[PDB]
């Protein structure tokens, strides 16, 4: 017998409290003896133990989790979500293989919300040290999926920028990005217009924040 | 009352050893199958490996990329679970837990010799795996220029090991702050954005300072940050 990959989809579901969350799980083969799992990960904590065997239910789990599928496809269900069963879930197989699935996170719904964009140049300290970062802010969004794409001199920058985002702010349940574009002092002095431009989809058009370098 | 305790986690150069330890308690060890499962940081869960009972052979199945360098084994006399970890690469820096898993709670037939038996996890040990050495952290302001809101920022740049806390105002600044997770950058150092949002009326009347405290390297930082002299 073979290794088995699997497939957890989909990635994100964006769901509201007293809804019904419905999670796939395919396979590449057939599980042996549906011998599939469902594990609970809030962050900062280890794994709870939710669903074996396709469609037992644990100890403890509360009554509105439940499991199904068998041979190539599972199902992992919440009738009513309390405010506690917002986070990540994986499923797990253990028949032949043992691999888990890539995660799906569950993150609470809200209204639409556009980023506020910033722009802050290196500072002269920085440049005194060799090196130039340049930071673009996306500030108090949703949902998630952001595009931050750097221009320095109207050129598309690739692979020399970075990013970070918070997880959704408990009071406003919004998303906060943070991207920095990292340059050589030498290279940053040979140019002049630096602009980060987000595209997101509470923004009629993507919007654009730049300087002007030594301004 | 079932704990699994973790130990032995560490920074480690590339091509090292490292033993990792986890003892049991609660519970009866022997007849419980044990797995290793590793996360790297921002990432999915990995199983690395597990070993089943005595009574089931002991036998151990391991994940691809650790099989010919990862070694479960298991020491039933004091109940503890070892995960011996040679040629160590950098993308084996992880929390790594150990834990009965659903193979142990499942051929249980749900819960429980003494009385029952519930599904058990580790708070984790942290293996990292990378060449570096310890240095502190240089502290850069995101000036502003505005509007009515007004964004100002630390950006805390090329420090190893983690981690870094950053507060404002001596903490006494929480409404509006985003401190970023860290990112690795290719040179082998992190770094780590803090912003906070905040009224344009009040950028003369109140001052923002951020505190940055790297301990590994016993630093301790205060920056100033406002808006860029336009002189």
């Known amino acids: 017998v073979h290794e088995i990959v699997l497939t957890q989809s989909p990635g994100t579901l964006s769901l509201s409290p007293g809804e019904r969350a419905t999670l796939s799980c395919r396979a590449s083969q057939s599980v042996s003896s549906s011998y599939l799992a469902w594990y609970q990960q809030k962050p900062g904590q280890a794994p709870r133990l939710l669903i074996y065997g396709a469609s037992s239910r644990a100890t403890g789990i509360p009554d509105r989790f439940s499991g199904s599928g068998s041979g190539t496809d599972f199902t992992l269900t919440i009738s009513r979500l309390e405010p506690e069963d917002f986070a990540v879930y994986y499923c797990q197989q253990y ?57 320095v001199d109207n050129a598309l920058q690739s692979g020399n920028s970075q990013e970070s985002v918070t997880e959704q702010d408990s009071k406003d349940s919004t998303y906060s990005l943070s991207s920095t574009l990292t340059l050589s002092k030498a290279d940053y002095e040979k140019h002049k217009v630096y602009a980060c431009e987000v595209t997101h989809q509470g923004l009629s058009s993507p919007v654009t924040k730049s300087f002007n370098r030594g301004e | 009352e079932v704990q699994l305790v973790e130990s032995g986690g560490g920074l480690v150069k590339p091509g090292g050893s490292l033993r990792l330890s986890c003892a049991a308690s609660g519970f009866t060890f022997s007849n419980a199958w044990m797995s290793w499962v590793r996360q790297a940081p921002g990432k999915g869960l990995e199983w690395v490996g597990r070993i089943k009972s005595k009574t089931d052979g002991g036998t151990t199945d391991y994940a691809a990329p650790v099989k010919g360098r990862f070694t479960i084994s298991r020491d039933d006399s004091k109940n503890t679970l070892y995960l011996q970890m040679n040629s160590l690469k950098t993308e084996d820096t992880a929390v790594y837990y150990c834990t009965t898993g659903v193979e142990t709670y499942d051929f249980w037939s749900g819960y429980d010799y003494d009385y029952y038996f519930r599904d058990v996890w580790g708070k984790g040990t942290t293996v990292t795996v990378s060449s570096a050495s310890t240095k502190g952290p240089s502290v850069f302001p995101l000036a502003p220029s505005s509007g009515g809101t007004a964004a100002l920022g630390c950006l805390v740049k090329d420090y190893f090991p983690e981690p870094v806390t950053v507060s404002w105002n001596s903490g006494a600044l929480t409404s509006g702050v985003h401190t970023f997770p860290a990112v690795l950058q290719s040179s082998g150092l992190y770094s780590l954005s803090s912003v906070v949002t905040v009224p344009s009326s009040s950028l003369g009347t109140q001052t923002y300072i951020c505190n940055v405290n790297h301990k590994p390297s016993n630093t301790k930082v205060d920056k100033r940050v406002e808006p860029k002299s336009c002189d």
């Open chain 1, 95 to 151: 028949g032949s293989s043992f691999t888990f699935g890539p995660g799906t996170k569950v993150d609470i719904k809200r209204t639409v919300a556009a980023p506020s964009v910033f722009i802050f140049p290196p500072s002269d300290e920085q440049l005194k040290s060799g090196t130039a970062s340049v930071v673009c802010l996306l500030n108090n969004f949703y949902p998630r999926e952001a595009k931050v794409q750097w221009k």
